[PDB]
Amino acid sequence: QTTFNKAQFQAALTRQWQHFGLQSASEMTQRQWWRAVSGALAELLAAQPVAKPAQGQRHVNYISMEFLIGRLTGNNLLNLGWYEGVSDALKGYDVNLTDLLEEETDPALGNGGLGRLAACFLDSMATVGQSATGYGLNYQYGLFRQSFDDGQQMEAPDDWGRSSYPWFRHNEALDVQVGIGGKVSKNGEWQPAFVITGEAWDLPVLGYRNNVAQPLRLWQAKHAHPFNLTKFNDGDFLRAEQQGIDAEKLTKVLYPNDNHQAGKKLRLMQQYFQCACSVADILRRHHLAGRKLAELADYEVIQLNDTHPTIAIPELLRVLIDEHQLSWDDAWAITSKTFAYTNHTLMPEALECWDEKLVKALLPRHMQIIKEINDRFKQLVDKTWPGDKQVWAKLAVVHDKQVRMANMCVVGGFAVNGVAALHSDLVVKDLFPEYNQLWPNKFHNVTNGITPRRWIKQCNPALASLLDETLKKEWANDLDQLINLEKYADDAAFRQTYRDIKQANKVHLAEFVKQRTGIEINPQAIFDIQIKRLHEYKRQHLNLLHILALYKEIRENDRVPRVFLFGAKAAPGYYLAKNIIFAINKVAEAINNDPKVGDKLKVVFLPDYCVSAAEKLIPAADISEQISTAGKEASGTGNMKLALNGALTVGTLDGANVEIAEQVGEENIFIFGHTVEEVKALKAKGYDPLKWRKKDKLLDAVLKELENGTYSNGDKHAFDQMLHSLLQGGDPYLVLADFEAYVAAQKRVDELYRDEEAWTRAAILNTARCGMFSSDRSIRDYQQRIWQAKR
Amino acid sequence: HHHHHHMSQTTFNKAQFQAALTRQWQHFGLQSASEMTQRQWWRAVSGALAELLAAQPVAKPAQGQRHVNYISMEFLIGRLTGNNLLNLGWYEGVSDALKGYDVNLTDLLEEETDPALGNGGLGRLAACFLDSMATVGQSATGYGLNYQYGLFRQSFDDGQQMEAPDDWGRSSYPWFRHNEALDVQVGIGGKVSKNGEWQPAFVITGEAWDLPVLGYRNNVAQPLRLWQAKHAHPFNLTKFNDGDFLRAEQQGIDAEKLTKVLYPNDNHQAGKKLRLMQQYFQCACSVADILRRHHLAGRKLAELADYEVIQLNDTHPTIAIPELLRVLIDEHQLSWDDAWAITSKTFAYTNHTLMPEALECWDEKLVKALLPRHMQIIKEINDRFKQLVDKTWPGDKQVWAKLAVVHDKQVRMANMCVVGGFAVNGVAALHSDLVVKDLFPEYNQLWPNKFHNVTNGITPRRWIKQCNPALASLLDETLKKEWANDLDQLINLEKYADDAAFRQTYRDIKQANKVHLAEFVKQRTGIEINPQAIFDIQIKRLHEYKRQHLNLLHILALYKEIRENPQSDRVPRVFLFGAKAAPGYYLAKNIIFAINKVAEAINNDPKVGDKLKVVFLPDYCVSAAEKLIPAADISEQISTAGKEASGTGNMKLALNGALTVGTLDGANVEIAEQVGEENIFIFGHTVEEVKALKAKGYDPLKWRKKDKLLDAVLKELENGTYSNGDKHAFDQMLHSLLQGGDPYLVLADFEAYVAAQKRVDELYRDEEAWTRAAILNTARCGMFSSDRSIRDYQQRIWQAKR
Ligand SMILES: *Cc1c(COP(=O)(O)O)cnc(C)c1O
Ligand SMILES: *Cc1c(COP(=O)(O)O)cnc(C)c1O
């Protein structure tokens, strides 16, 4: 690892403020300082020699519609080992590095766990030495920036300075032309009606202390003729920009509303644009390496993260057949050995499908290709289930004027994997059982993971230092070493040091909470954290009901003091989720100001949850809330972050809680509530939440407080949408049915927290036993089972 | 006169250049310099030079001299990379270094689209002036707009002018620097409260995008600060999620439209409103930036005029005057008298206009709606000026109607400039006299020290040393003293007109320039032009009064003469045009159509062959001018007498050795005086003769019936000869010449023009007498250096006592 060169950094920093047009470094604003330091570091990085790839290893092309990368400058310094050198150089300018890093708005490039998984996997590939390129979209405004207006969620664009972001590099020789719409001539020539330019905007992915730097390649859409001077000179200044906007709209927003025809068409264009550019770029790299097209699968593999990039399959077929004149069988022999598909889905109804009419109109050549895939696949299905029209309707790639993208992924690729042992079994038994009959060796598991660089070393540096002194071998790229901590759970000095670190993290969070909300929270209390997206089945309103129960007990009658912290976004137009957010904020207003409670209870809903906020919340967690309805979580990478940093999990037996309980032991986790099978049986027998209300005085009471205006200044319909989902709507995620199990589990939490030694033992054991959650281990599993396997 | 400019050439450093180049292709994400495309090579070389420039020591401003803020709505700067290398003295060093990469520097420079930041001579004057201020050590900032698409990019489709956006990679242009600390907030519309607080309806951010203006071998680098408009909240997520993707961008597009296009069509109300917003945005940003510099230098607001002067190039930035009053009054609580005491000693105004009817005016209804607080300030200017007019012409209502700043619901911007400033100047001796006599005689009575002349000029760096390096090195070898920042040295060339070896070298250079233009013409049009022919060049904007169609009728006459007599003794000719017609200018576009159709016929007629070709080079620009001007034998300067104040193109062509065929008006007057009547071809009706002819009732139909040659060439345009039978092809041009009354006297000057062009043949036949005349045009035109212009501005206005 090349060491920090202070004189080179100084010369690079000087070039930055000279380029701004300033006379000295001291003239910079705090924003300019962050841009200049980041740009200087980018210059030094770009001068570093490129560590060459491992011979005889396939290069991985990882395609994802989100990359939730978080801030990059601090992460890059940690991976290079330059943090201390830069920190000290900046003290010479009276600049505080840690404060400067807070100038960076998180690049708004992803939404949730799907995009954070892609980011952790890029980081791990760079660290374990898997040559790879990430392929995404360079979104200008992300999903949205969340704020609270009288407790209601408000949505604005999440701008992040995309065009001026200092870590970008743009090689214009990688621009790609993408066609849209039009017709296919009688002789098979696609004549698009609209053409878009894709520019590659590259961010660096740095490996840990190994001089590896690989690209996250983010495509940005533009038009070659965006502006119509005739319309401008006629006075129509807005419509003059129309052609440009029709291209640039592809990379404005992540997951824009698709409940209408314009938005459905937009989503499909985004996916195709991403895949046409990516496919062109992969073939260009292969060609410039002097490699033959027929051997593409020997040198390259393409990982499809969910079904969003499915269209890459017929796009690659299109290029091979139409632009390189390969036979169908020769083209398919390549694509069918190049594409692998990662499934994140639990129910068949959630698999992605497109109206054939929209695909035909938008991508007429691809629709012909897709129908030929479909027609050729029918021969095999009829061989195996002769005359069975029902099996064909299920397995078809096109049927009833519908294109089944997940089906096309299974039929068109050599591997399918789920993201946890139980999920990957369900992929085979529930989603694709017939396909598994045809192609048993196609299906695999790779359990998800998280990078220990960002999520321990960077956000929890004091815990990281403890691990450095205690463990014999390096652990930051060898997380299985954490198991050697088990012994120190019995050492009273270790315990005291470890618990002190957790308390110092809770104090640090207290500051951050007081800056954003002004609320003062009690660091002696239990920090009880739920950081899931806001969806009904995540049951933030189950959390709410328990909080109301705690609030009620304090108002009347020795519970441990608590601080409930929430971070969650709701999709725009998801009115029920937004009403749950409204209730939580309204109830927190009462609790935080009510003098009857004081320092016994506070609720903090931090707005605009993002990677940067998670780095501050997660090291401070005592309790990790993982209370989704059993059956509805395949994984849970947040769960893994929280456990490794020494929070204890309260949760249902599903998703990543299964893995955590398996590793840490029943003494060290709080599993509760209906199992997957018990949820199904309760609905099968007839579940009425109203009957459960009638027999539960505490439950009826907290729900009365939400119906009678106690938290809305006398509006009885403030929380109307939440309450109807729980009562006449039928409570389909079983908030009431799990209520008393949850309340009872949380009482066990109190008891452990009073036994300070036993609590700390449990926390240490969560850190020590969860080394398997490293995304380095995930990547090695992908390498052995899929990417580097023999075809 | 002996000028002593402090020379300071930091020498080229090949190692530093190599390291900067390496950072550029590393920043592109490449593995070696050799991977670069041609376009990347230009970006990398230009960006490396920008890094080295930014690392040079910054020249400090001259002690005790006012700083000049030069505000213009256009800056026609041309390509920067080659000019910057020449001013730095690094051209040969970079050329040699690039040979080590097998890169040819002169080829690489051609990758650059001219920054589309100006239109014609008004903007090129502003660019020559900025270059000269840097070279003479006048501390200065130019203030303009960072137009994304310029005026338009010109092409020809079946001979007709087509107009497209003139995109030039604005946001990625490698010489730009942007200091976000200079961003300015600009308000639009709204209302003024009863307490006098302006509450705007729309707010726009102005970003300063700076280009460097480099002096000649003196390490001076000064900013051309170009404002670009943006909105702080350009994008509406609710509308995007509703599927209204274009309307989602409305707020941003409504701000950005201010710096999209230069001189957008204002034939309609939306365009008029846009132009006024463009002008206000430029002036609000510039005024804020000037005050910021003054305040950061620790200087007192009351002393602004002792340290700063603001030059208004034409009336487009007039609104800067009430804008500075607004800031002084509303934001610094100055009384009107104390504010006016500052502004009236800070602003100076350069007039380019000839007719009172052409002076810029705005509807009061529109100024009130867009700038309600400024309208109040402007009325106060008006009301206070009336008290002065009352004292001098009491109760005279016609005088007041003439001099008022606001009258009959119109705001007179030129009047506001005179009333509100301390100096007014015209751009040539005779023009500046007419400004006082015809335009502003009453103002000159009130303020007899306010009016001046400063004759225009051009920079010798771009317009001789860069575009004509062979002539430059002849001047170097011959004069043995530096002439590029001391152009009056050219007068020492006079005697070399009698040195046959010099004449031969000077002639070899003209001919080599013609060969180089022939290559470029072949590359751009496919036409092979004859380098032994007279290269006859007209490079004016396309306007009826520039009379490109007088040139056309003469071409037709020459074509007829040598078609009907293959034994004709006329000298071979190549007629070259560069000209854009403003969008929507239908007559000018029909003149273009006629020229291109006649050229098509001539160029493909084997009867004439290499005796005659006509080349209309599309998309005339600075870079095209640098190829055409050094190759010119004849400089066409044939506007109707009375319609030209100046003619900077005229000066460039004369210095590079072309002889002028022109009317006695504009810059031709001063050229003819300097070079002598024997060395120029003045023709046609005088200014006075034009006026008298029209008053006697001029009827072009009568002239046509008495002139059989004129009748014959016009018939060729009427009967489908050049039109594949379409007799209506040139209806608009023919009508303007005939039933329309020929207002610019094309027919009246035709035979005088034909006769002058025959004298051109006769001189060109004796290459000694021709070369002698050309040498003496180069030798005697040193006064047309923009360095001399700047010295005059300094002595008379910028550094004068108030
Ligand atoms: C890790 C992470 C996630 C995923 O966490 P889950 O509990 O699986 O939803 C989402 N957002 C951010 C910012 C994260 O860091
Ligand atoms: C010098 C110049 C002008 C001004 O020339 P005129 O003959 O006065 O119109 C206009 N355009 C360009 C490109 C020039 O170089």
- CATH assignment of the domain containing B218: 3.40.50.2000
Residues B414, B471, single domain; the answer is no
Q: Is the four-CA dihedral B9, B10, B14, B18 of positive or negative sign?
A: negative
Beta strands in B94-152 (DSSP E): 140-145
Three-state DSSP class for A21? Answer: coil
Are A399 and A287 contained in the same domain?
yes
In a domain, B9, yes or no: no
Q: After which residues is chain A broken (C to N over 2.5 A)?
A: 557
Q: Examine residue A530 and state whether it is found in any structural domain, yes or no.
A: yes
Method: X-ray
| Strand pairing category for A300-305 and A339-342 | parallel
Inter-chain CB proximity A227 and B165 less than 8 Å: yes
A60: which residues sit within 8 A by CB, 6+ positions away? Answer: A125, A130, A131, A132, A133, A301, A303, A787
Provide DSSP, B394-435: TT-HHHHHHH-SEETTEEEHHHHHHHH-SEEEESSHHHHHHI
Rounded Cα distance between B47 and A630, Å, is 59
Report the C-alpha gap between B550 and B536 in whole angstroms. Answer: 14
Q: What is the resolution of this structure in A?
A: 1.9
Question: Which pair of structure tokens corresponds to residue B415?
Answer: 């009047």
Distance of CA A632 to the CA centre of its chain: 17
Q: State the angle between helix axes of A540-555 and A697-707 in degrees (0 to 180), rounded to the nearest 10.
A: 100
- The number of CA neighbours under 13 Å toward the Cβ of B449 is 7
Contact B29 A23 (CB under 8 A): no
Distance from the Cα of residue B724 to its chain's centroid: 38
- Rounded distance between C-alpha atoms, residue A546 and residue A542, angstroms: 6
Please indicate if any CB of chain A lies within 8 Å of the CB of B15: no
Residue B4 is assigned to a structural domain of this protein: no
Does ligand 2 lie within 6 Å of residue B540's CB atom? yes
Q: Tell me the C-alpha distance between B208 and B206, whole Å.
A: 7
Nearest bound ligand to the CA of residue A69: 1
| A154/A236 same-domain check | yes
Q: Which residues pair with B659 in a beta bridge?
A: B634
Q: Which run of H or E residues covers position A469?
A: helix A461-470
Measured between CB atoms, does B179 come within 8 Å of chain A? yes
DSSP secondary structure letter of residue B458: B
> Which residue among A64, A66, A68 has the greatest number of ligand 1 atoms within 8 angstroms of its CB, and so is best to mutate?
A68
Residues B472 and B464 sit within 8 Å (Cβ to Cβ): yes
DSSP secondary structure letter of residue A419:
S
Q: How far apart are CA A453 and CA A461, in angstroms?
A: 10
At position B423, the amino acid (one-letter code) is A
Counting ligand 1 atoms within 8 A of each CB, the residue from A117, A611, A624 with the most, and so the one to mutate, is A611
The rounded distance, in Å, linking the Cα atoms of B723 and B726 is 5
B435 and B514 within one domain: no
Element containing residue B91 per DSSP (H, E) = helix B91-99
Option in A27, A229, A242 nearest B261 (CB): A229
Residue A344 annotated among the catalytic residues of the structure: yes
Sheet holding A213-222, edge to edge: A176-180, A194-206, A213-222, A132-137, A59-63, A300-305, A339-342, A415-418, A443-445
Does A456 map to a domain?
no
Instruction: Report the first-to-last Cα separation within chain A, whole angstroms.
Output: 35
- A234 CB neighbours in chain B (<8 A) are 265, 268
**β-pair partners for A147:** A154
Q: Are residues A401 and A496 both part of a single domain?
A: no
Strands A398-399 and A670-671 turn out to be: unpaired
For residue B629, which of B661, B666, B654 has the smallest C-alpha distance? B654
DSSP H helical segments within A289-388, as ranges?
296-299, 312-318, 324, 328-335, 356-362, 364-384
Q: Are residues A465 and A444 in the same domain?
A: no
Taking a C-beta distance cutoff of 8 angstroms, is the pair B280, B227 a contact?
A: no
State both tokens at A660: 């955590």
Do β-strands A145-149 and A152-156 pair in parallel, antiparallel, or remain unpaired? antiparallel
Distance (Å, whole) CA B657 – CA B228: 40
Chain A residue closest in CA terms to B232: A159
Rounded to a whole number of angstroms, the distance from the CA of A269 to the nearest CA of chain B is 14
On whether the CB atoms of residues A304 and A339 are closer than 8 A, the answer is: yes
CB B455 within 8 A of CB B670: yes
Task: With CA atoms as reference, report the closest residue to B501 among B764, B763, B768.
Answer: B768
Chain B residue nearest residue A264, CA to CA? B243
Task: Evaluate whether residue A730 is within a structural domain.
Answer: yes
CA dihedral A562, A567, A573, A574 (to 10 degrees): -50
Q: Kindly provide the b/e burial profile for residues A72-98, where b requires at least 16 CB atoms within 10 angstroms of the residue's own CB.
A: bbbbbbbbbebbebbeebbeeeebebe
Asked if A572 has any chain B CB less than 8 Å from its own CB, the reply is yes
Residue the block writes with tokens 């036409």: B527
Q: Is the dihedral of CA A249, A253, A255, A261 positive or negative?
A: negative
Q: What is the 3-state secondary structure of B33-58?
A: HHHCCHHHHHHHHHHHHHHHHHCCCC
Which residue is listed with tokens 């509100």? Answer: B420
A533 catalytic? Reply is yes
φ and ψ at B53, to 5 degrees? Answer: -60, -50
Cβ atoms A504, A462 nearer than 8 A: yes
Based on the fold, state whether residues B493 and B381 are members of the same structural domain. Answer: no
Angstrom distance (rounded) from CA B559 to CA B721: 13
Q: Tokens standing for A25?
A: 């470094």
Task: Give yes or no: residues B640 and B716 share one domain.
Answer: yes
Task: Take residue B71 and report the two structure tokens written for it.
Answer: 């505000």
- Residue B417's domain comprises 14-456+790-797
Q: Which residue has the tokens 């109109």?
A: A361
User: What is the number of the ligand 2 atom nearest to the C-alpha of B624?
Assistant: 13
Q: Which residues 6+ apart lie within 8 Å of B520 measured at CB?
A: B627
Flag whether residue B246 sits within 8 Å of chain A, measured between CB atoms.
yes
| Alpha-carbon gap, residue A202 to A166, rounded angstroms | 11
Residues contacting residue A407 through CB under 8 Å, at least 6 positions apart: A351, A395, A396, A397
Q: Which residue has the tokens 């000049």?
A: B68
Assess whether B464 and B443 both reside in one domain.
no
Q: Where are the alpha helices (DSSP H) in A517-567?
A: 540-555
Secondary structure (3-state) at A784: helix
Place of tokens 């993408």: A178
Rounded to 5 degrees, what angle do the CA atoms A311, A313, A314 make? 75
Q: What is the dihedral of CA B501, B507, B509, B511, to 10 degrees?
A: -140
Rounded Cα distance, A46 and B24, in Å: 10
Is B802 a domain residue? no
Ramachandran angles phi, psi of B686, nearest 5° = -75, 175
Residue A1 falls inside a structural domain: no
Rounded-to-integer distance, Cα B648 and Cα B541, Å? 13
CB A277 within 8 A of CB A258: no
Sign of CA dihedral B507, B509, B513, B518: positive
Total domains in the fold of chain A? 2
Query: Residues 622..641 of B with a Cβ closer than 8 Å to A: which?
Result: none
Contact A245 B245 (CB under 8 A): yes
Q: How far is the CA of A226 from the centre of ligand 1 (A)?
A: 38
DSSP state letter for B181: G
Beta carbons of A637 and A450 less than 8 angstroms apart? yes
Question: Is A257 in Cβ contact with B243 (below 8 Å)?
Answer: yes
Catalytic, B374? Answer no
Q: Cα separations (Å) of B799 from A52, B71, B243? A: 64, 17, 59
Comparing CB atoms, the residue among A169, A229, A573 nearest residue B163 is A229
Helix (H) or strand (E) holding A403: strand A402-404
Write out chain B residues lying below 8 Å of A257, CB-based: 241-243
The amino acid at B450: K
Given strand B406-407, what is the order of strands in its sheet? B361-363, B410-412, B406-407
Scanning A24-53 for CB atoms below 8 A from B yields: 27, 29, 31-32, 43, 46-47, 50
- How far, in Å, are B126, B133, B386 from residue B74 at the CA level? 7, 17, 33
Amino acid at A245: I
Could you tell me the two tokens for A470? Answer: 């205690």
Q: Which residues in chain B have their CB less than 8 angstroms from residue A233's CB?
A: 261, 264-265, 271, 583-584
Cβ contacts below 8 Å, chain A against chain B, sum to: 147
Backbone angles phi, psi at B645, to 5 degrees: -80, -35
Query: Both tokens of residue B473?
Result: 């090195």
Q: What are the chain B neighbours of A157 within 8 Å (beta carbons)?
A: 235, 237
Compute, in angstroms, the gap from residue A559 CA to the centroid of ligand 1: 30
Q: How far apart are CA B596 and CA B615, in angstroms?
A: 8
Beta carbons of A19 and B163 less than 8 Å apart: no
| Residue B355 CA: distances (Å) to CA of A58, A304, A352, B437, B793 | 77, 71, 71, 11, 24
Determine contact, residues B637/B663, Cβ cutoff 8 Å.
Answer: yes
Distance CA(A428)–CA(A448), nearest Å, equals 18
Domain identity same for B438 and B464: no
Residue type for position B341: A
Q: Do residue A467 and residue A373 come from a single domain? A: no
Q: Which residues of A259-269 are buried (b: 16+ CB within 10 A; e: fewer)?
A: eeebbbbbbbb
Structure tokens, A154: 């408000």
A32 and B180 in contact by Cβ < 8 A?
Answer: yes
Nearest-angstrom CA–CA distance, A464 and A461: 5
**Does residue A509 share a domain with residue A369?**
no
CA A381, A384, A390, A395 dihedral sign is: negative
Q: Which long-range contacts (CB under 8 A, 24 or more apart) does A283-289 make?
A: A283/A319, A284/A174, A285/A59, A285/A133
Instruction: With CB atoms and an 8 Å threshold, state whether A256 touches B242.
Output: no
Considering the domain boundaries, does residue A27 fall inside one? Answer: yes
C-alpha span between B650 and B489 (Å, rounded) = 20
C-alpha–C-alpha distance, residues A543 and A603, integer Å: 11
User: What does each C-alpha distance from B142 to B126, B208, B277, B348 come to in angstroms?
Assistant: 8, 11, 20, 15
Atom 4, ligand 1: residue with shortest CA distance? A113
Q: How far is the CA of A626 from the centre of ligand 1 (A)?
A: 12
The residue with tokens 């369900």 is A426
Measured distance CA(A675)–CA(A730) in Å, rounded: 19
How far is B271 from A133, CA to CA, in rounded Å? 49
DSSP secondary-structure letter at A598?
Answer: G
How far, in Å, CA of A112 to CA of A116, rounded?
6
Tokens of B657: 């050795």
